Short mmCIF file of C-alpha atoms in Angstrom, two decimals:
data_model
loop_
_atom_site.label_atom_id
_atom_site.label_comp_id
_atom_site.label_asym_id
_atom_site.label_seq_id
_atom_site.Cartn_x
_atom_site.Cartn_y
_atom_site.Cartn_z
CA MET D 7 0.00 0.00 0.00
CA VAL D 8 2.55 2.54 1.18
CA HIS D 9 4.61 2.71 -1.99
CA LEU D 10 7.48 5.19 -2.25
CA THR D 11 9.54 5.77 -5.38
CA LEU D 12 12.53 7.86 -4.34
CA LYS D 13 13.69 9.91 -7.31
CA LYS D 14 17.02 11.64 -6.69
CA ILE D 15 17.62 14.69 -8.87
CA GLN D 16 20.48 16.17 -6.84
CA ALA D 17 23.91 14.50 -7.07
CA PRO D 18 25.10 12.29 -8.49
CA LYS D 19 21.38 11.71 -9.15
CA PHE D 20 19.51 8.42 -9.62
CA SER D 21 16.10 6.78 -9.32
CA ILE D 22 15.23 4.14 -6.72
CA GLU D 23 12.14 2.60 -5.21
CA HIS D 24 11.21 1.08 -1.86
CA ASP D 25 8.24 -0.63 -0.21
CA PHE D 26 7.67 -0.47 3.54
CA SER D 27 4.80 -0.94 5.96
CA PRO D 28 3.02 2.19 7.32
CA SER D 29 4.49 1.93 10.82
CA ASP D 30 8.01 2.29 9.42
CA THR D 31 9.70 5.68 9.64
CA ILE D 32 11.46 8.00 7.22
CA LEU D 33 14.53 7.52 9.43
CA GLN D 34 14.53 3.79 8.78
CA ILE D 35 14.35 4.50 5.05
CA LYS D 36 17.21 6.95 5.56
CA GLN D 37 19.27 4.43 7.53
CA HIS D 38 18.61 2.16 4.59
CA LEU D 39 19.98 4.58 2.03
CA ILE D 40 22.95 5.02 4.35
CA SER D 41 23.44 1.27 4.70
CA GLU D 42 23.28 0.83 0.91
CA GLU D 43 25.75 3.70 0.48
CA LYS D 44 23.32 5.91 -1.39
CA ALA D 45 23.86 8.65 1.17
CA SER D 46 25.92 9.73 4.16
CA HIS D 47 23.51 10.45 7.02
CA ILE D 48 19.73 10.41 7.62
CA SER D 49 19.50 14.23 7.45
CA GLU D 50 21.62 14.43 4.26
CA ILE D 51 18.62 12.75 2.69
CA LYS D 52 15.62 14.95 2.03
CA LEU D 53 12.41 13.03 1.34
CA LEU D 54 9.57 15.17 0.03
CA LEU D 55 6.03 14.03 -0.69
CA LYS D 56 4.08 16.30 -3.04
CA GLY D 57 6.44 19.13 -2.13
CA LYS D 58 5.86 18.48 1.57
CA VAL D 59 9.05 18.36 3.63
CA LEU D 60 9.11 15.07 5.51
CA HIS D 61 11.07 15.09 8.77
CA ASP D 62 13.97 12.77 9.65
CA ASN D 63 11.80 10.36 11.72
CA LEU D 64 8.31 10.93 10.25
CA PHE D 65 6.13 7.79 10.50
CA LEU D 66 4.67 6.47 7.25
CA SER D 67 1.28 6.12 8.94
CA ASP D 68 1.20 9.90 9.22
CA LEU D 69 2.40 10.27 5.64
CA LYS D 70 0.01 7.71 4.18
CA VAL D 71 1.79 7.55 0.83
CA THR D 72 -0.89 6.33 -1.54
CA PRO D 73 0.14 4.46 -4.74
CA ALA D 74 -1.40 7.36 -6.66
CA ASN D 75 1.10 9.75 -5.07
CA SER D 76 3.99 7.31 -4.82
CA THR D 77 6.46 9.65 -6.53
CA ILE D 78 8.87 10.87 -3.88
CA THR D 79 11.49 13.54 -4.41
CA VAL D 80 14.66 12.44 -2.66
CA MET D 81 17.32 15.10 -2.37
CA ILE D 82 20.57 13.52 -1.23
CA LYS D 83 24.03 15.02 -1.23
CA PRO D 84 26.74 12.43 -0.37
CA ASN D 85 30.02 13.30 1.32
CA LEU D 86 31.96 14.40 -1.75
CA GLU D 87 35.29 14.84 0.00
CA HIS D 88 37.29 13.61 -3.00
CA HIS D 89 39.69 11.43 -1.01
CA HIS D 90 39.33 8.16 -2.92
CA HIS D 91 38.25 10.07 -6.02
CA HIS D 92 41.46 12.11 -6.06
CA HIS D 93 44.60 10.21 -6.97
#
């Protein structure tokens, strides 16, 4: 039911999708993007639903992301410190 397609149009940009149960939190989704190295920290990930700023630990039962509004804008900016990238 609670279907969230996280489209990242920031840097280096990408498009992902996730499915979680309503009692899960934005923070868990964030921790997930961290754990899959798609981001640095929970807050460095901005999840927006219909232009609405979702908070770090917002519960999905309060969001109620309907399949009809499943398009999520995810603004993530990873730690581009250029250590491994710079040789």
